[PDB]
Amino acid sequence: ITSSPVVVALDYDNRDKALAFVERIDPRDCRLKVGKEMFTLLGPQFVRDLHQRGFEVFLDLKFHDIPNTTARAVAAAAELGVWMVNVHASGGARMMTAAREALLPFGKEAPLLIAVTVLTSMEASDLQDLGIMLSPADHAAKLAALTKRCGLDGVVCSAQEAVRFKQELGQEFKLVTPMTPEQAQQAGVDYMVIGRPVTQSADPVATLASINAS
Amino acid sequence: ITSSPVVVALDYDNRDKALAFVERIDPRDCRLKVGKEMFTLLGPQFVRDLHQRGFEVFLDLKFHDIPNTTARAVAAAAELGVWMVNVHASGGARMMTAAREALLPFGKEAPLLIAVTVLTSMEASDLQDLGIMLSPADHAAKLAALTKRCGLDGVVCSAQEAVRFKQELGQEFKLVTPIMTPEQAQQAGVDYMVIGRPVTQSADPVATLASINASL
Numbered sequence: 001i002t003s004s005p006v007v008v009a010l011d012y013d014n015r016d017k018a019l020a021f022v023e024r025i026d027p028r029d030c031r032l033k034v035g036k037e038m039f040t041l042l043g044p045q046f047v048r049d050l051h052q053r054g055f056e057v058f059l060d061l062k063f064h065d066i067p068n069t070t071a072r073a074v075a076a077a078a079e080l081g082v083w084m085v086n087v088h089a090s091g092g093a094r095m096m097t098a099a100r101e102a103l104l105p106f107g108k109e110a111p112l113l114i115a116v117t118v119l120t121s122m123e124a125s126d127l128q129d130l131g132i133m134l135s136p137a138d139h140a141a142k143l144a145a146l147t148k149r150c151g152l153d154g155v156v157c158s159a160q161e162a163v164r165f166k167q168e169l170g171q172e173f174k175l176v177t178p179m180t181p182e183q184a185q186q187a188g189v190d191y192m193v194i195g196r197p198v199t200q201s202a203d204p205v206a207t208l209a210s211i212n213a214s
Numbered sequence: 215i216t217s218s219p220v221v222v223a224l225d226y227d228n229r230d231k232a233l234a235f236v237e238r239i240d241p242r243d244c245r246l247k248v249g250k251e252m253f254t255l256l257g258p259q260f261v262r263d264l265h266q267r268g269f270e271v272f273l274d275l276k277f278h279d280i281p282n283t284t285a286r287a288v289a290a291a292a293e294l295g296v297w298m299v300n301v302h303a304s305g306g307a308r309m310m311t312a313a314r315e316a317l318l319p320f321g322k323e324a325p326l327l328i329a330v331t332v333l334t335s336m337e338a339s340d341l342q343d344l345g346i347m348l349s350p351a352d353h354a355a356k357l358a359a360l361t362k363r364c365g366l367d368g369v370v371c372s373a374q375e376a377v378r379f380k381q382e383l384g385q386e387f388k389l390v391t392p393i394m395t396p397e398q399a400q401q402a403g404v405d406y407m408v409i410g411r412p413v414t415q416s417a418d419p420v421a422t423l424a425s426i427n428a429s430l
């Protein structure tokens with residue numbers, strides 16, 4: 001297992017460079033996130049290699065499709081054994097319900113099922129283009145609320161909103177964040193994705209130690 | 215390369231079933247669509263395996279992420295040599311621009327870059343949960359217009375919007391459709407037509423395809 005809430009983003013262009021960083025660290029100190037870049041390049045096999053090496057994996061593919069296809073993609077993630085997988089709440093309640101129901105047969109050995117609400121990249125201008133008058137946080141709030149209605153395990157959101165979300169949605173609703181690793185823990189966050197501060201550091205392990213220690 | 219506008223959806227749950235079907239057909243008669251069902255199970259190597267068999271491939275993963283991540287995913291698809299790849303218009307105009315710019319190094323060898331607008335699964339009630347009061351057809355038209363503004367090659371849409379989108383967006387702008395029949399889809403202006411079970415679960419898929427192509 002691992003006591004850490006830290007998930008280290010592996011956003012590498014190349015297999016060996018990723019694994020050479022992964023050798024330098026220990027499954028006890030963090031989990032790993034595998035996103036669309038490395039998955040499109042290497043496939044589930046890279047996730048298996050991380051599993052061999054003892055790590056738990058957040059498969060961050062942000063599934064956004066019709067309900068049958070998302071349910072089958074999420075079930076494939078569960079068959080792969082990953083620890084967390086995410087879907088777009090923008091896919092709607094039926095799609096999330098279907099992703100949830102696909103995991104029921106896996107029991108307590110299913111990955112956590114997290115919704116992306118509003119991508120951290122989106123400003124209000126981006127939202128106007130798509131016909132969303134609200135602010136990024138009000139729309140994210142509405143999507144988070146829809147996510148909890150469908151019984152998913154939690155949402156991706158800013159640490160700024162952790163306070164507000166743990167309020168409206170409950171303590172057990174997991175908040176994943178893609179404001180210090182101390183300030184965020186106190187404000188509600190459950191797991192913390194951190195990339196370059198760890199992967200571009202000199203002693204990622206010590207950096208890991210330092211974040212963890214707080 | 216085939217002259218057929220048919221793209222047969224590979225939505226199997228294992229490699230051997232998929233290959234049993236694919237080895238029955240000829241790459242001159244159709245293209246193949248690989249979506250999340252099979253990419254999450256078998257990864258990019260399955261795409262390379264289909265190319266070894268001579269097929270062109272629509273990688274249907276519907277990338278919806280921040281711009282710099284989508285852009286890397288799109289370039290990974292072009293490095294794979296796929297014929298088509300898609301993204302969600304919902305990711306916004308900067309994500310689509312970043313996707314298009316990721317294909318500039320690949321020149322004429324680049325995949326066609328297509329944006330999903332509204333998934334065919336979404337009814338008005340599914341959209342209202344999200345704060346969209348526009349009808350699906352109108353929300354898709356809005357996303358389709360944004361897609362063309364960003365310089366992408368076309369959109370996924372229903373044959374029911376085909377005539378509309380060709381009027382609004384022009385003959386060059388590609389329409390990929392996933393009840394109207396093939397010939398009627400063509401007549402409406404659809405460029406490429408994804409077809410799944412009618413072919414994959416047919417008695418003789420070689421014969422079902424040939425009948426489809428004959429009407430086109």
Ligand code: NA
Nearest residue numbers: 119120156178
């Ligand atoms: Na995000």
Ligand code: NA
Nearest residue numbers: 333334370392
């Ligand atoms: Na669709």
